[PDB]
């Protein structure tokens, strides 16, 4: 139930429950999910947090 995505843009966390990440970083996204913030785990860092859904594309 996880799908791989890539960051299209750099993003500085806007809450302490957001991830910060770089353009080109990859993530696992939990599948069930909608609204505009998705729970992501960075494959680069291993950290988990929210990301804006429109900052990523399927990879």
UniProtKB/Swiss-Prot annotation:
Its domain of life?
Answer: Eukaryota
Q: In which tissues is it expressed?
A: Expressed in the epithelial cells of renal proximal tubules and stomach as well as hematopoietic cells in the bone marrow and spleen in the fetal tissues. In adult, expressed in epithelial cells of the renal proximal tubules and present in keratinocytes in the basal epidermal layer of epidermis.
Give the subcellular location. Answer: Cell membrane; Cytoplasm, Cytoskeleton, Microtubule organizing center, Centrosome; Cytoplasm, Cytosol; Cell junction
PTM description: Phosphorylated. Phosphorylation by CSK on the C-terminal tail maintains the enzyme in an inactive state.
Q: Where is the SH3 domain?
A: 1-59
Q: How does it assemble?
A: Interacts with YAP1 and CSF1R. Interacts with CTNND1; this interaction allows YES1-mediated activation of FYN and FER and subsequent phosphorylation of CTNND1. Interacts with FASLG. Interacts with IL6ST/gp130. Interacts with SCRIB, when YES1 is in a closed conformation; the interaction facilitates YES1 autophosphorylation.
- What role is this protein assigned? Non-receptor protein tyrosine kinase that is involved in the regulation of cell growth and survival, apoptosis, cell-cell adhesion, cytoskeleton remodeling, and differentiation. Stimulation by receptor tyrosine kinases (RTKs) including EGFR, PDGFR, CSF1R and FGFR leads to recruitment of YES1 to the phosphorylated receptor, and activation and phosphorylation of downstream substrates. Upon EGFR activation, promotes the phosphorylation of PARD3 to favor epithelial tight junction assembly.
Which family is this protein grouped under? Belongs to the protein kinase superfamily. Tyr protein kinase family. SRC subfamily.
Identify this protein by name. Tyrosine-protein kinase Yes
Say which species the protein is native to: Homo sapiens (Human)
Quote the gene name from the UniProt entry. Answer: YES1
Residue span relative to the full protein:
92 to 150 of 543
């Amino acid at each position: 139930g996880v799908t791989i995505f890539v960051a299209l843009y750099d993003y500085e966390a806007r809450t302490t429950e957001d991830l910060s990440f770089k353009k080109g970083e990859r993530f696992q996204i939990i599948n069930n999910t909608e609204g505009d913030w998705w729970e992501a785990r960075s494959i680069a860092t291993g950290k988990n947090g929210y990301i804006p859904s429109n900052y990523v594309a399927p990879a």
